[PDB]
Structure 1
Amino acid sequence: ICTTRGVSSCQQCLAVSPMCAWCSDEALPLGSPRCDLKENLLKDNCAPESIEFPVSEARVLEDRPLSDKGSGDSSQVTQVSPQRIALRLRPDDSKNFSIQVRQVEDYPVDIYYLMDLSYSMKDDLWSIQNLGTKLATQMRKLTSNLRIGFGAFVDKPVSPYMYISPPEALENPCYDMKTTCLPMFGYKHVLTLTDQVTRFNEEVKKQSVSRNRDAPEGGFDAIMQATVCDEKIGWRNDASHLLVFTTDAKTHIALDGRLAGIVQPNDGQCHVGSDNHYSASTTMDYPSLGLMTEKLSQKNINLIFAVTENVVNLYQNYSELIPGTTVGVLSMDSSNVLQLIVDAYGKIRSKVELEVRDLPEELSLSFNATCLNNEVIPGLKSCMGLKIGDTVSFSIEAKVRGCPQEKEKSFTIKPVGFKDSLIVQVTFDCDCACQAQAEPNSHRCNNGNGTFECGVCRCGPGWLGSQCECSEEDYRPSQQDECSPREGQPVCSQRGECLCGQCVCHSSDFGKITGKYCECDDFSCVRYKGEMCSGHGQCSCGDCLCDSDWTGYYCNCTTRTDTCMSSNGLLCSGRGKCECGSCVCIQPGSYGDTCEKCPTCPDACTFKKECVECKKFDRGALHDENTCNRYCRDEIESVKELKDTGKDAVNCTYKNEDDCVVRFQYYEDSSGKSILYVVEEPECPKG
Structure 2
Amino acid sequence: INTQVTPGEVSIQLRPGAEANFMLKVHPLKKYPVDLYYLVDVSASMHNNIEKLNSVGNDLSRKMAFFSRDFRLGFGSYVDKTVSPYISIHPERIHNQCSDYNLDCMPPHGYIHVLSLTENITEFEKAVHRQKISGNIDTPEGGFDAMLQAAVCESHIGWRKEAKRLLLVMTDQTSHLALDSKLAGIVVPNDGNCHLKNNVYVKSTTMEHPSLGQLSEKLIDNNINVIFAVQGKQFHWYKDLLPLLPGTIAGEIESKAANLNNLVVEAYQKLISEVKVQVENQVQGIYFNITAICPDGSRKPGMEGCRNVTSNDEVLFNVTVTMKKCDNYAIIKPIGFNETAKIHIHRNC
| TM-score with structure 2 setting the length | 0.95
Partner of 2:222: 299
Partner of 1:160: 85
Q: What is the DSSP-based 3-state SS (H/G/I as helix, E as strand, rest coil) of the residue aligned with 1:162?
A: coil
Residues 465-504 of structure 1 aligned to structure 2 (within 5 Å): none
Partner of 1:175: 99
Deviation at 1:311, TM superposition (A): 1.0
Q: Distance in 2 between matches of 1:262 and 1:288?
A: 14
Q: Which structure: larger Rg?
A: 1
Q: Does 1:89 align with 2:14?
A: yes
- Please give the per-residue CA displacement for 1:515-557, whole angstroms capped at 9, x wherever unaligned: xxxxxxxxxxxxxxxxxxxxxxxxxxxxxxxxxxxxxxxxxxx
- Please give the per-residue CA displacement for 1:561-610, whole angstroms capped at 9, x wherever unaligned: xxxxxxxxxxxxxxxxxxxxxxxxxxxxxxxxxxxxxxxxxxxxxxxxxx
Partner of 1:315: 238
Partner of 2:65: 140
Partner of 1:377: 299
Partner of 1:244: 168
Compared with structure 1, are the counterparts of its residues 389 and 259 closer, same or farther at alpha carbon in structure 2 (3 Å cutoff)? farther
Q: Is residue 300–residue 306 contact of structure 2 (8 Å, CA) maintained in 1?
A: no
Q: Distance in 2 between matches of 1:172 and 1:368?
A: 55
Partner of 1:149: 74
Deviation at 1:363, TM superposition (A): 1.7
Q: Distance in 1 between matches of 2:89 and 2:292?
A: 57
Which structure 1 segments of 5+ residues have no match? Answer: 1-63, 65-75, 431-687
> Among 263, 270, 294, which residue is 2:187 paired with?
263
Compared with structure 1, are the counterparts of its residues 114 and 389 closer, same or farther at alpha carbon in structure 2 (3 Å cutoff)? farther
Q: Distance in 2 between matches of 1:287 and 1:150?
A: 22
> Among 27, 33, 37, which residue is 1:102 paired with?
27
Give the stretch that moved more between structures: 121-130 or 246-255.
121-130
Q: Distance in 1 between matches of 2:275 and 2:284?
A: 24
> Among 52, 56, 69, which residue is 1:127 paired with?
52
Q: Distance in 2 between matches of 1:337 and 1:82?
A: 38
Q: What is the DSSP-based 3-state SS (H/G/I as helix, E as strand, rest coil) of the residue aligned with 2:77?
A: strand
Partner of 1:422: 341
Counterpart residue type for residue 133 of structure 1: N
Q: Does 1:342 align with 2:250?
A: no
Compared with structure 1, are the counterparts of its residues 378 and 223 closer, same or farther at alpha carbon in structure 2 (3 Å cutoff)? closer
Q: What is the DSSP-based 3-state SS (H/G/I as helix, E as strand, rest coil) of the residue aligned with 1:284?
A: coil
Residues 33-112 of structure 1 aligned to structure 2 (within 5 Å): 64=1, 78-112=3-37
Residues 504-515 of structure 1 aligned to structure 2 (within 5 Å): none
Residues 559-638 of structure 1 aligned to structure 2 (within 5 Å): none
Q: Distance in 1 between matches of 2:17 and 2:36?
A: 47
Q: Distance in 1 between matches of 2:130 and 2:300?
A: 54
Q: Is residue 124–residue 332 contact of structure 1 (8 Å, CA) maintained in 2?
A: no
- Please give the per-residue CA displacement for 1:439-478, whole angstroms capped at 9, x wherever unaligned: xxxxxxxxxxxxxxxxxxxxxxxxxxxxxxxxxxxxxxxx
Which structure 2 segments of 5+ residues have no match? Answer: none
Deviation at 1:163, TM superposition (A): 2.6
- Please give the per-residue CA displacement for 1:589-635, whole angstroms capped at 9, x wherever unaligned: xxxxxxxxxxxxxxxxxxxxxxxxxxxxxxxxxxxxxxxxxxxxxxx
Q: Distance in 2 between matches of 1:359 and 1:140?
A: 42
Residues 448-467 of structure 1 aligned to structure 2 (within 5 Å): none
Deviation at 1:155, TM superposition (A): 0.7
Q: Is residue 173–residue 232 contact of structure 2 (8 Å, CA) maintained in 1?
A: no
Counterpart residue type for residue 385 of structure 1: N
- Please give the per-residue CA displacement for 1:197-225, whole angstroms capped at 9, x wherever unaligned: 22111100111011111111000011110
Deviation at 1:320, TM superposition (A): 2.3
Deviation at 1:378, TM superposition (A): 5.8
Deviation at 1:389, TM superposition (A): 4.3
Q: Distance in 2 between matches of 1:338 and 1:414?
A: 30
Q: Distance in 2 between matches of 1:95 and 1:242?
A: 36
Deviation at 1:79, TM superposition (A): 1.0
Partner of 1:286: 209
Deviation at 1:418, TM superposition (A): 1.2
Give the stretch that moved more between structures: 98-107 or 359-368.
359-368
- Percent identity between matched residues is 40
Aligned residues between the structures: 348
- Please give the per-residue CA displacement for 1:98-153, whole angstroms capped at 9, x wherever unaligned: 11112211111111101110122222111211312221111112002211111100
Counterpart residue type for residue 259 of structure 2: N
Q: Distance in 2 between matches of 1:235 and 1:143?
A: 16
Q: Is residue 295–residue 313 contact of structure 2 (8 Å, CA) maintained in 1?
A: no
Partner of 1:188: 112
Residues 639-650 of structure 1 aligned to structure 2 (within 5 Å): none
Q: What is the DSSP-based 3-state SS (H/G/I as helix, E as strand, rest coil) of the residue aligned with 2:181?
A: helix
Q: Distance in 1 between matches of 2:120 and 2:266?
A: 23
Q: What is the DSSP-based 3-state SS (H/G/I as helix, E as strand, rest coil) of the residue aligned with 1:110?
A: strand
Compared with structure 1, are the counterparts of its residues 197 and 365 closer, same or farther at alpha carbon in structure 2 (3 Å cutoff)? same
Deviation at 1:235, TM superposition (A): 1.3
> Among 333, 352, 358, which residue is 2:275 paired with?
352
Partner of 2:322: 399
> Among 122, 127, 131, which residue is 1:207 paired with?
131
- Please give the per-residue CA displacement for 1:485-512, whole angstroms capped at 9, x wherever unaligned: xxxxxxxxxxxxxxxxxxxxxxxxxxxx
Q: What is the DSSP-based 3-state SS (H/G/I as helix, E as strand, rest coil) of the residue aligned with 1:341?
A: helix
Partner of 1:412: 331
Counterpart residue type for residue 427 of structure 1: H
Residues 516-595 of structure 1 aligned to structure 2 (within 5 Å): none
Deviation at 1:179, TM superposition (A): 2.2
Q: Distance in 2 between matches of 1:330 and 1:205?
A: 21
| TM-score with structure 1 setting the length | 0.49
Q: Which has the higher contact order (CA 8 A, sep 6+)?
A: 2
Q: Does 1:232 align with 2:156?
A: yes
- Please give the per-residue CA displacement for 1:25-80, whole angstroms capped at 9, x wherever unaligned: xxxxxxxxxxxxxxxxxxxxxxxxxxxxxxxxxxxxxxx5xxxxxxxxxxx6x211
Partner of 1:609: none
Structure 1 residue ranges (4+ consecutive) displaced by more than 6 angstroms after TM superposition: none
Give the stretch that moved more between structures: 351-360 or 409-418.
351-360
> Among 353, 365, 387, which residue is 2:288 paired with?
365
Q: What is the DSSP-based 3-state SS (H/G/I as helix, E as strand, rest coil) of the residue aligned with 1:169?
A: coil
- Please give the per-residue CA displacement for 1:410-430, whole angstroms capped at 9, x wherever unaligned: 221111011211111122344
Counterpart residue type for residue 168 of structure 1: E
Compared with structure 1, are the counterparts of its residues 91 and 214 closer, same or farther at alpha carbon in structure 2 (3 Å cutoff)? closer
Q: Distance in 1 between matches of 2:99 and 2:4?
A: 54
Deviation at 1:180, TM superposition (A): 1.6
Compared with structure 1, are the counterparts of its residues 175 and 134 closer, same or farther at alpha carbon in structure 2 (3 Å cutoff)? same
Q: Distance in 2 between matches of 1:172 and 1:401?
A: 61
